[PDB]
Amino acid sequence: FFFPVGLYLPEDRGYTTVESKVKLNDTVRNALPTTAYLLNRDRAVQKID
Amino acid sequence: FFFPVGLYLPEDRGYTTVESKVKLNDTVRNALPTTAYLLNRDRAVQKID
Amino acid sequence: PILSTTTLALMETKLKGGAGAFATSETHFGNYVVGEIIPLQQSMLFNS
Amino acid sequence: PILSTTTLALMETKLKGGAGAFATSETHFGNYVVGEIIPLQQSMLFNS
Amino acid sequence: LTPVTMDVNYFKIPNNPRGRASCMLAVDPYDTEAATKAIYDHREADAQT
Numbered sequence: 001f002f003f004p005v006g007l008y009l010p011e012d013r014g015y016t017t018v019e020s021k022v023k024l025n026d027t028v029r030n031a032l033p034t035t036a037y038l039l040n041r042d043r044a045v046q047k048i049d
Numbered sequence: 050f051f052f053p054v055g056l057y058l059p060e061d062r063g064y065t066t067v068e069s070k071v072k073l074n075d076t077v078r079n080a081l082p083t084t085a086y087l088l089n090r091d092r093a094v095q096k097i098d
Numbered sequence: 099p100i101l102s103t104t105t106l107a108l109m110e111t112k113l114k115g116g117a118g119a120f121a122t123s124e125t126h127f128g129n130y131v132v133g134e135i136i137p138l139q140q141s142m143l144f145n146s
Numbered sequence: 147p148i149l150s151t152t153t154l155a156l157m158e159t160k161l162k163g164g165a166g167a168f169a170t171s172e173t174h175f176g177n178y179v180v181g182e183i184i185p186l187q188q189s190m191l192f193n194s
Numbered sequence: 195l196t197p198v199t200m201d202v203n204y205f206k207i208p209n210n211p212r213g214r215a216s217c218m219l220a221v222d223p224y225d226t227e228a229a230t231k232a233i234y235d236h237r238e239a240d241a242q243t
Contacts, residue, residue, distance in 0.1 A: 001148040003180065014175045022155040022174065025063040025127070031176045033152035039187055044207050045157055050100040051211040057198045058128050064155035065126045066162070071107045073126070080128050082104035088139055094109060099205055122162050123206050132205050 005036035005048060054085035054097060101139060105129040117141070149187060153177040165189070204243070215241045 024030045036048050073079045084098040101120050103109050108131045112119050120140040123133040136142070149168050151157045156179045160167050168188040171181035182188065196213075210216060214233070220241060221229045231238060 003148050003150040005150075005152075007178075009173070009176055009178065011176075016174045017172050018156070018159070018174055020069065021066070021159055022153075023065045023068050024153065024155060024174070024177075025060060027061050027063075029061045030064075030153070033177055035152065037151050037154060037157045039149055041191075042207075043161075043187065043192070045154075045203055051205070051209075052100050052102040052132060053196070053200070053202070053205050054102075054104075055198070056104075056130075056200060056202055058125070058130070058202060059199075060128070062154070063127045064153065064158075066124050066155055066158050067108070067111070067126055071111055071126065073105065073107060073129075079105070082129055085102050085104060086106055086109050087100065087102050090143070092113075092139065092144070094106075099208065124158060124162060125202075130202060135208055 003036065003038070006034060008032075052085065052087070055083055057081070099132050099135050101132065101134045103129070103131045147180050147183050149180065149182045151177070151179045209243075215243070217241075 034049065038046050038048070040046050084096055087095050087097070089095055101112070103112070105126070108124075108126070108129060112131065117140070118137075121133045121135075121137065123131050125131070134140075149160070151160070153174070156172075156174070156177065160179065165188070166185075168182045169185060170179075172179050184190075200213075204213075216233045218229060221232055232241065
């Protein structure tokens with residue numbers, strides 16, 4: 001398997017398709033993804049920085 | 050059984066997933082949780098602080 | 099883990115919901131629900 | 147590809163979703179989910 | 195008593211309430227030093243988290 005962490009999506013053409021489902025605080029730490037969340041061998045969450 | 054009371058969730062990455070389901074009026078007493086709610090052996094509501 | 103929540107509003111939301119509502123944890127900005135791991139309270143004690 | 151997200155809100159949404167939720171990839175403004183190509187973690191390991 | 199910043203995701207799945215795993219079926223049988231290292235040694239990563 002392969003998965004990315006830390007990508008910068010093009011901001012000039014930003015878009016959302018889940019605006020009715022999630023809402024985030026207006027912090028730049030939310031705006032810049034710096035972590036990745038995965039599922040363990042059990043369906044439990046794990047994090048990488 | 051184990052359960053938490055009084056935790057502080059990180060505001061720098063705060064989020065909501067139930068915005069369309071619930072709304073709280075603006076108040077730091079709502080913003081900072083300090084009690085926990087649970088059910089009896091009957092399905093009545095009980096409170097701890 | 100046992101069903102618990104920091105706000106009464108999310109408790110009301112769980113009580114109004116259908117079957118299986120007790121199992122799903124979810125969070126508001128600074129409030130959260132923790133869902134029971136087995137359907138004890140919702141069904142297994144009262145269905146008989 | 148494996149199920150990965152850049153924010154915890156989208157992971158919570160995936161966990162609250164029904165069957166087939168893990169397979170769909172979707173993006174917020176700066177945040178995104180990559181969907182599982184094989185329904186492995188969601189069903190095939192645990193349906194035994 | 196727990197720190198205010200304890201991870202909330204810890205409470206969403208079954209776990210050891212002390213904050214570190216000590217299930218002894220993971221340790222080699224009759225290996226006292228390995229078992230005590232798993233339970234108490236905080237310079238070694240906790241199992242399952």
